[PDB]
């Protein structure tokens, strides 16, 4: 299961989505933004990044990705606005505020403590390239898991 | 073999790090002179042309009217707001310090902000309350002692008065601040000009005068990531060329085994700083309200205005003092262009020439504009249906 056990089981909510069918590299970016954030400011960052009001700071999986001015917030020039990945993150954060609520915990004091998008087993599909070749297409679905303690 | 395409001393061709066109070097100080300011920020308006009688022994045009293009540069008075002294050092000039004016126009303090109106607007607030106190008056007094002592260079920190520019298109309300060197006499003389002039306006007509030249410096008009054909002037390749025409076909050789800094490459063209020399001042022009018959020369008496009929395109009326100087000026319309006293010898037979304008042009820029005057256009068409549908309404009232 979780790479890191929550410090205080009763005070934290865990959530996860295995074989999430969003790009790993985009979801890798999208979930890492959240890793220290309070859940409401993380619900927010996504609602705002879903509006093209703010960007997810792509960091590791930059590549020749385009420069944006909304990335200044994050300390670098490159940034990006996944939607499929931002929605899955909200949809996994709903999962935990639900998990957090049942524990009697208060979702709006709750803080993201551990986000970890592992890359999942990949799905094959086929190209059909120039001179009779057939190279791979492969989605790179991510395993995202997280928990969110609220402070004591 | 043919000459090289482009001047390598204008390089890198990168975006200027400013836009205000600050003077790079002031003309060398001459003690024999009385003290004066050496530059003046002005806003490019647009161009026109003028007729003039060249009276230049030699040439086929002496005694003959010639149509020179002119740039009009609206020039609201700059305000001095502080003095600055430089002391020479073995490592190079160091500011001794600056004495700020007791008061600063908001347009100036706007300059220290990205969002003045959502700011606490505290700029020069401690100075204002401290320059008042005798403690801060003695401190200001000591700075001037340091100027009169350790300085080699006195410089006013002047700024543009955009409030007074009233241009509807020059959107800035931050003032265009800039040090303006005082070449002149002894440092006490320069301090004295500097401090008497330490909160006063400074019209161009004091700094400049007609027929004298001015060096201009303004960032040139921006063209973005220009290609090599437009950037350097290289020949484009023959149609049959494959990868593309608009390229330098050979950006290097085997050795040196890398592109040299001298081969032309696509990138920023325009919006480079430039100091262009020897621009004759065909007329200083007083503000339209003060001296309404601008562009009314001795030989063209109709009361008139330096601004064309449609206004300057993209700029509008020149509501202020204007410098009118021969030829092009670098930069787009409504850019702020610093223009200094000439650094060239200016003893040329041409440069010294007095320029008596025979006809400022005032036709519309926009279309061809065959009328010099809004009155004259009406004097052509006479009344027409807009008036009859107007005149009739007035009679009914």
């Amino acid at each position: 299961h979780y790479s890191r056990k929550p410090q205080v089981s009763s005070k934290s909510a865990k959530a996860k989505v295995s074989d999430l069918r969003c790009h790993f590299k985009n979801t890798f970016e999208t979930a890492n933004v959240i890793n220290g954030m309070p859940l409401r400011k993380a619900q927010q960052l996504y609602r705002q990044v879903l509006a093209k009001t703010r960007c997810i700071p792509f960091k590791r999986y930059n590549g020749k990705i385009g420069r944006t001015a909304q990335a200044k917030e994050w300390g670098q020039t490159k940034g990006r606005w996944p939607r499929k990945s931002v929605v899955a993150m909200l949809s996994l954060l709903k999962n935990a505020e639900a998990n957090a609520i049942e524990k009697g915990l208060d979702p709006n004091k709750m803080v993201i403590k551990h986000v970890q998008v592992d890359q999942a087993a990949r799905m094959r599909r086929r190209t059909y390239r120039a001179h009779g070749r057939i190279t791979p297409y492969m989605c790179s679905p991510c395993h995202v898991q997280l928990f969110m303690t609220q402070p004591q | 073999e043919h000459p090289r395409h482009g001047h390598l001393g204008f390089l890198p061709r990168k975006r200027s790090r400013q836009i205000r066109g600050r003077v790079r070097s002031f003309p060398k100080d001459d003690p024999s002179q009385k003290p004066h300011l050496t530059s003046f920020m002005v806003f490019k308006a647009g161009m026109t042309h003028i007729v003039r009688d060249v009276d230049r022994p030699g040439s086929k045009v002496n005694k003959k009217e010639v149509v020179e293009p002119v740039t009009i540069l609206e020039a609201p008075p700059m305000v001095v707001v502080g003095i600055v002294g430089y002391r020479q050092t073995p490592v190079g000039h160091k500011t001794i310090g600056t004495v700020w004016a007791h008061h600063t126009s908001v347009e100036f303090r706007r300059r220290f902000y990205k969002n003045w109106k959502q700011s606490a607007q505290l700029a020069f607030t401690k100075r204002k309350q401290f320059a008042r106190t005798t403690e801060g008056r003695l401190a200001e007094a000591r700075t001037l002692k340091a100027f009169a002592k350790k300085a080699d260079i006195i410089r006013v920190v002047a700024h543009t008065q955009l409030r007074k520019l009233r241009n509807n298109r020059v959107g800035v309300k931050k003032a265009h601040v800039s040090e303006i060197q005082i070449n002149g006499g002894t440092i006490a003389e320069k301090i004295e000009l500097a401090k008497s002039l330490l909160e006063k306006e400074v019209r161009i007509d004091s700094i400049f005068q007609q027929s004298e030249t001015c060096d201009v410096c303004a960032v040139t008009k921006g063209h973005g990531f220009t290609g090599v054909v437009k950037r350097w002037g290289v020949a484009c390749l023959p149609r049959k060329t494959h990868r593309g025409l608009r390229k330098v076909a050979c950006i290097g050789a085997w050795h040196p085994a890398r592109v040299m800094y001298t081969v032309a490459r696509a990138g920023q063209h325009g919006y480079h700083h430039r100091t262009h020399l020897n621009k004759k001042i065909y007329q200083l022009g007083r503000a339209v309200s003060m001296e309404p018959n601008q562009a009314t020369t001795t030989y063209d008496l109709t009361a008139k205005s330096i601004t064309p009929m449609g206004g300057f395109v993209g700029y509008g009326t020149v509501r202020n003092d204007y410098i009118m100087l021969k030829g092009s000026v670098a930069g787009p319309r409504r850019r702020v262009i610093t223009l200094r006293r000439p650094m060239a010898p200016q003893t040329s037979r041409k440069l010294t020439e007095q320029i008596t304008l025979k006809f400022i042009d005032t036709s519309s820029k926009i279309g061809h504009g065959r009328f010099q005057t809004k009155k004259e256009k009406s004097q052509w068409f006479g009344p027409l249906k807009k008036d009859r549908i107007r005149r009739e309404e007035r009679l009914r009232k």
Binding site: - | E1, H2, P3, H49, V51, V54, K60, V61, K64, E65, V66, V67, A235
Partner: protein, 127 residues
């Protein structure tokens, strides 16, 4: 002064001249310092090495000189008056610049007539 170049080598300007030359074929422009690919270009007042391409055979196959006296390529006076011609024709002339015709046909340009004292006289008009 400056006269925007009008008649590059290879051009066939007409002979305005009295002579039996019917038209000139500019071969090169006298006084042409050359940049690399640039073609030499005669403009108004310019002397020009030209072979008559049509007209009396006696003129037909030797290089000749000819000043350009008019020009479709418009140019700007220092007076600010851009101006141009219906046609661009020259007149045959000696290396000295004395013209070999006895009387020019149409109008001669002002800066043809001013460079060439003899051309100016035979010119029916100056423009």
């Amino acid at each position: 002064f400056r006269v925007s170049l009008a008649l590059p080598v290879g051009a066939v300007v007409n002979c305005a001249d009295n002579t039996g030359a019917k038209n000139l074929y500019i071969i090169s422009v006298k006084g042409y310092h050359g940049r690399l690919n640039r073609l030499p270009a005669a403009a108004l007042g310019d002397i020009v090495m030209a072979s008559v391409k049509k007209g009396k055979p006696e003129l037909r196959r030797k290089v000749l000189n000819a000043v350009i006296i008019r020009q479709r390529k418009s140019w700007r006076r220092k007076d600010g008056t851009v101006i141009y011609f219906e046609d661009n024709a020259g007149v045959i002339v000696n290396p000295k610049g004395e013209m070999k015709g006895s009387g020019i046909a149409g109008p001669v340009a002002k800066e043809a007539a001013d460079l060439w004292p003899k051309i100016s006289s035979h010119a029916p008009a100056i423009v």
